Amino acid sequence: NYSQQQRDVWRLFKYINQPSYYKDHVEIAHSYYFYDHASNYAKHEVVEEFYRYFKYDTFLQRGEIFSVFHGEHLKQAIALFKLFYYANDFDTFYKTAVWARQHVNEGMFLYAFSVALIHRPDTYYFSLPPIYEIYPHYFYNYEVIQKAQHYKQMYYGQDGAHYNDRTIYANYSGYYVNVYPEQALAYFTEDVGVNSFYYYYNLYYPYWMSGEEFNLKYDNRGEIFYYMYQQILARYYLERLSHGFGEIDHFDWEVPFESGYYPSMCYPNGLYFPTRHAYAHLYEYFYNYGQHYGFNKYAHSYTHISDYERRIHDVIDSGYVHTHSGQKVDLFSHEGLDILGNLIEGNPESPYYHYYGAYQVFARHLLGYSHQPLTFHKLHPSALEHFETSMRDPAFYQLYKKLLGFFFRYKSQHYHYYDEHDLAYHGVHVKHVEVDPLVTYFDYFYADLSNAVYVTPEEFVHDSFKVHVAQERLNHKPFTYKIYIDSDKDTEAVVKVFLGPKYDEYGRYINLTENWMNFVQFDHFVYKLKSGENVISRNSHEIYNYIHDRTSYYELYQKAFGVQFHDNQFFFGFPQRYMLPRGSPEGMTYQFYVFVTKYHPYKAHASVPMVGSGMHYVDAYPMGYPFDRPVYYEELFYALPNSYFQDVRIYYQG
Amino acid sequence: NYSQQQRDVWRLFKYINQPSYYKDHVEIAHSYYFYDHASNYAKHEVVEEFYRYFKYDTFLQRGEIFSVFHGEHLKQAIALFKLFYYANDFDTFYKTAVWARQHVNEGMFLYAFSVALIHRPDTYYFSLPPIYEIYPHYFYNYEVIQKAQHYKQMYYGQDGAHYNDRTIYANYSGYYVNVYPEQALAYFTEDVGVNSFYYYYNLYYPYWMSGEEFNLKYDNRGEIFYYMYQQILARYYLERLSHGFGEIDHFDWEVPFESGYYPSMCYPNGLYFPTRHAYAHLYEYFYNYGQHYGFNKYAHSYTHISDYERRIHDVIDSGYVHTHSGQKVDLFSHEGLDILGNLIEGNPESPYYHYYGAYQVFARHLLGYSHQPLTFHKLHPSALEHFETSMRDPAFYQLYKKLLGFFFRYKSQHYHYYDEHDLAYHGVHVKHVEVDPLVTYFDYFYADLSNAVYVTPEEFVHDSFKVHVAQERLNHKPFTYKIYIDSDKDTEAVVKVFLGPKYDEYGRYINLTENWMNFVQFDHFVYKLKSGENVISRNSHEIYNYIHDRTSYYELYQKAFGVQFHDNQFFFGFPQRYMLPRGSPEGMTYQFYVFVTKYHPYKAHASVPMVGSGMHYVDAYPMGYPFDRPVYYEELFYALPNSYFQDVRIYYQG
């Protein structure tokens, strides 16, 4: 049944670094042969491609590091995902998944299987075990994995109820070593929930998936790319303001990269993560000094980065894009932001991928600053080269701020600033907003770390060994804010609440003209107004639209994890405990912007909740609609009756 | 008995990272109290000092990294060594050793115990288990330790004769990552035998031990410092010539350090070794960027290095040393090289330690290029900051070449070049030298790696788990060289054979004037000549005087390890398999210099073989006597009848 399919899906993720020792899994893997049948998949091309990869010494063996930002790794993972996705029936998909689990590389199998599960018509609504639990090596410092393995080695017969079911109290990166100050925001950048958010966003909309083939173009994906990255940057800026940090550092490709990253994580094969030192020179000569290369295109990541940056600048200035036809494509269309997002991201929907390329891929390779692989099968990728650990690197935020500057330039040059009438909602007036005291504190979070040790077959079958990891994760006391609206008739409005800063780290007031980009979508719902006075009450545990529209969320929770506050993986999901940025004992001061507008339903492609169905969104206004473009008159945003600015102090206790 | 004492000493070194689970060890540690007795040690000051360190929160707890190049680590290790050494009877020493094993930090205990054992009157002749087996984390890449721990976790009841007694085939540093080319000589720099040699040399003559208190001044220690480091540098240069490398890179403190080091080792607490990146800036600002410091003197290692280098330059130029009396001390005495060695090294015999200081300590701290410790108990030292891993870093060789340049300057300015009469041995003529074909090849070396995993008490007591590591170590086919001498009367001569290069990496002939420093002491023995023709036959397995005089060696082998080719630890010990530098299939060409001189017995302080007894040496000539100073006429060294130059090709096969 659906419950049994869910349980089997979860079973498939146990002890990924080891072969599946379940009897059914072993039998299925040893007896099944995808190429032998070759008829149960909707397409024979996908199976033929995967067979070509698998047989003729062009496949990533078990035990090798997998990176989705390496070309051949990506090609093989795509082939496996297509094999999983084009299974005519779920039974064939399960047999293929079991075989791949037992035979295909661990990281490659995990990525292909996850993308298939979120994207398959049948298994879209399947919950997935938290990634930080499945593959913990990417989420905890090696001082935690090594301690878990200490307990595992010591747990043998003697000393019962000792070295078992033990809680490892992990610290964040800067506890032991005095790492670079930017890594002081380690409890946020290295939070398992935030990295899970980024990883699940990339699972939902992979940078290599084509919107024509996989229906991701009905979700725009360019506006998604832009809005998701801008919201991540804005939430990071809010956290930095909380901790007294300033705006994210600006960096030049031609100046030594002033920031260094010292990861504390380790690969399951005993290989430590690459380290980027302070003031690292990013030039071909310096970042390939003392290396072989010769036929590695990533060795020249600097020249490719400069080329793609130049091309993006040119297309944004002109507003005219080059296509394979070499013709003139208008970028001023209604969906010009979408075209720009596809162009910059590098997804198969890019106007000309050969010309604009994957700027982010080469930027991550260069800023990761690790040795170029001697061979395909001997690769040493950095944090920036994985989705699960990208947010841990400050260079991640600096790189994507450099990217979003391009979108800001496009909007500034080609978008007309909103006037009073465009934002006006005649007959609606937000009288005042009451928000309960916003308090943020730290609490311990317990996660099943047992997947980081090597279990014996009996232990595997019975899960006898248990080892937890406890981590201080920011949490907030539940709050409920009220919105009072005085309408003129029974209209159907859309309410959009934003969270942004009012004062910078130096206490200076930030004008909306230089502050529109720092606003974080706090809630985005639809309310049916009535003539006269209305009161809108919203709880903290009812907000599912943080920095992202998730309208069909919680119906998947009520089914999969609804058989509380359990890692969803449904849509993207920002941690409910990280919604409010850390405050101060005195209370760092932010402001909430409340907006109300008439309903504009989105062009939903289909009713079924699914990636690419278009059912995600609330309204058809541009994402972050009031602040999606530069603001030329702050007093205009203050004077709108259907708007309201309200100031709150978030209090940190601990 | 002596055998039982040896077995107990070896037992003390099992599973150092874990508490000793032997019943006797636990009983002794829990019942014994060194401060409680306080009378069994020759001095109450040492016990009082160690008690002060141990009780009042100024002691290094178990599980913390220990570095002998940190001031407070060194002070505590010295206190513990003095506690071990001043045990009036061996029984008290054993009780103290057991207690420290069970209670004192692992690295600190290991260092203090080893130094005491080599330096104690009673236990000088005790063999010690190989350091690369006792504390393998400093000798193998973490890809080996993690694999051993994989096997340990998997070895539980099921799968017998599987994951036990397994051989791990380890590779050298550049196998996986394309590390900097200087790390291509990894099979030599990272050889367990060579690093054991350096570590045992530093155990025998620690940089902090006073020659007055511990009789190390009867071994000069300054000439030892110089000659040992010069011979290490020369052997490294021979290896570099074998592999086509050139002279060791010269570096300026004021220019970015062009070489980078990427260690693959990991600390037992799951912390990866520090990495030095290519072209690392060594200035205060750059190597402390983004760090706290504030009361760390090592934070200003650059200024201290410059100061001490300036002082050393000044004293070598003047030949006049500053003392606490501030008076003029002649450096031109017979033992002026000894004074210079004590001055540069920084041992308590230094003429004024406050003024000249420990140049090597700060140089290692700076070139290690790691984060300065946030606290005494949270330290992250580099390879250069341990004796067991110093030779793995190319910066080690560059640093000590920079040091030995000072001694070269002293000798060039203040020593008169030898004439024909000084080197003459009238009546002696080396007719010709025959050396068997010198062949070097690789073979697997098996070492007990079981000490890198965590065993249960029953496994500890029975040593049930066994895991070996196999490594390709250079070995040479046994050879026997003949020396023909035509004497005039029955004299007693000293034979000194040197190994040095004839052609550089570019095929150019090296003149003795620029080649005297590159000669490696191959053998140094005494033969009783007879009137007329003599023939001297020496086997390869009878040479114990490689780059170091060990006359009282092999009598300790015949007793301790003599109850073959087992890691000695007696005196220093260069690996017998690394005596001949790797050749080439065509055969890299070197030359042997054979010298004969009349006997000059050394001023032996005592007959008993022991560190500081002066019994090490063969003759009283200056170490490397023919080549201890610059050569102003190579033809002079060729024309001496009692000398002979012979060319050999060493053939590499494999």
Residue numbers in the entry:
A (entry chain A), B (entry chain A): 25 to 587, 595 to 685
Please share excerpts from the published article on this structure.
Here, we show that coating the cryo-EM grid surface with ssDNA, or other negatively charged polyelectrolytes, reduced sample aggregation and improved the distribution of macromolecules in holey carbon grids for cryo-EM. The samples used for testing, hexamerin, human 80S ribosome and apoferritin, exhibited undesirable properties such as protein aggregation and/or affinity for the carbon support on standard cryo-EM grids. The use of polyelectrolyte-coated grids was essential for the determination of macromolecular structures from these samples. Hexamerin, human 80S ribosome and apoferritin are soluble macromolecular complexes with a predominantly negative surface charge.
Hexamerin is a 57 kDa protein from the haemolymph of insect larvae and pupae. It forms homohexamers with D3 symmetry. Purified T. castaneum hexamerin at a concentration of 5 mg ml−1 in pH 7.5 buffer containing 30 mM HEPES and 100 mM KCl was used in the experiments. When vitrified on standard holey carbon grids, T. castaneum hexamerin aggregated, rendering most of the particle images useless for single-particle reconstruction. The auto-picking procedure, as implemented in crYOLO, efficiently identified the hexamerin particles. The final structure reached a resolution of 3.1 Å and the surface regions of the cryo-EM map of the hexamer were of sufficient quality to enable model building. The mean shortest distances between automatically boxed particles of hexamerin, which has a diameter of 13 nm, in electron micrographs recorded on standard and ssDNA-coated grids were 16 ± 2 and 40 ± 13 nm, respectively.
